[PDB]
Amino acid sequence: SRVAELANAVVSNADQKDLLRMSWGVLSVDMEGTGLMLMANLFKTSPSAKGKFARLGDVSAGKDNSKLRGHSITLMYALQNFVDALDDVERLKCVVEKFAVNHINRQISADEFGEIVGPLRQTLKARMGNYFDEDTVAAWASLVAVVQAAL
Amino acid sequence: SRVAELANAVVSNADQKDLLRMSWGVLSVDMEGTGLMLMANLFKTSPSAKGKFARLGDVSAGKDNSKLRGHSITLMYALQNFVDALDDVERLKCVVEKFAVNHINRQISADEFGEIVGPLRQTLKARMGNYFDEDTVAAWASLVAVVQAAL
Amino acid sequence: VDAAVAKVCGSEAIKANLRRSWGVLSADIEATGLMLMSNLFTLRPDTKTYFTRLGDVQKGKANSKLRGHAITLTYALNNFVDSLDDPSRLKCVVEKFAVNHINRKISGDAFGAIVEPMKETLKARMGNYYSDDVAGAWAALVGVVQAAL
């Protein structure tokens, strides 16, 4: 697999790390709200994803759906985990591998997992406003690609 | 060359980072109190330090001396600075070099700078309680030694 | 679950003690997780057989699957602590967490094996800032998960 290669490449790329941490500083202000936003956007641009999340019930109901809420919050702590791993290759690798197993068990493939990038962009536009920059999206895409490699 | 060697060794030593961060969890609960304790211990074991810290006035007054409080608090953020630099060699080196410049300006020799280790040990023992260990002292001493190589 | 949540969220003291202890643990999230798991398997080796995917769990940080698990577990604690001001949030986070453990055949009684390991972890990491009320706070929080299982 390319997990080791891509994990090493992310940890050694100071440019990208800066963009990840700066934007995470904004995304993490409201963990629940931002998690729910990411998921809302996912379901809007990948309607095929809705069925995969059937355990959650009405995935369009946002904060009024307790299971979607718990899911969306927990998703944001997975991203916090990744962000806190950006200075240690073997740490990043092992947490990526952990979450890959979670997704493998739901038959989520690499390109399926990639469907989060558009949602991340829309969420970054909402959260960054006039300071939005596409280079940050590319930074998140690079991190997402480490997980994709593990799937 | 020597600062680089020692800084690279700190960044490469994972076990030592664990000891630094664990002990930091206790030292940083009460930054002000811990700083004052560290300084009190320094003045106890180094008579000469009182003279070098002449700006601070009557250091025997401890927490009731405002200049000593301001100093002691800032000292603790300098230790936070070290703790936050353990995964980035160029970061650690620039932090150390800045510390060295400041202490050179205040006529502090390498031997004088090393007077902090005993005080740290006593402070660590006061805070770590039944879970003090000698190895944690050596971990802090490694950081002190990088600065000593620069002085 | 609602009543167990309220025992925690309705107590200023429990919330304060969870928050201050979490402050200490958060100085090293990875080491917290590894120590908690080490204490679990040392104090309660009977629980080792629940962990069939993680290889040799006694190998600690060198076992990458255990390491990834231990780190991630500590972010679950982070999430619980960050949920204290909103009972409905703590509820939905714990309910999700409970599904994960039910899927691994963990009962409430089994989950309670963590209490003494947690107390030891708290004592070791907090030094002279430990008090028994801190252990009480974490036992109450573990009780929320037990109520959900």
Next chain:
Amino acid sequence: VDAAVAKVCGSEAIKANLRRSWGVLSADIEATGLMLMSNLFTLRPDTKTYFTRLGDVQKGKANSKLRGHAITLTYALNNFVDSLDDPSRLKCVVEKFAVNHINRKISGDAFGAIVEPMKETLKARMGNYYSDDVAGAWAALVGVVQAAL
């Protein structure tokens, strides 16, 4: 100085704004410091003259002396934020940092050069969570130092 301290410590709105903005900035202490210094020299190029020990301050992270400075500056901000519960702490911390700037012949007016640079740094790093009151909070904190200079 006392009046300026009371304006900060006595206002829950200022304290809450300093704390929530610091929450964001602390996601990357080093990057915050480097961005603040970049904005200082960009929005107030007249201030470059004071920082010639640091060499080419325009080089950012690659300039190790600038980097070391920027990191230390950001921990000074961290210190201010942790001084909000005790007006006497804030006073003595401000007085300490004032001593340093007095000795570099930095006047109150000169020190105030940081305010617009800080405002732009806050906008850039907080995104939609920025508010004018956040900049006001930081200006009030800078005002304490200005009163001491």
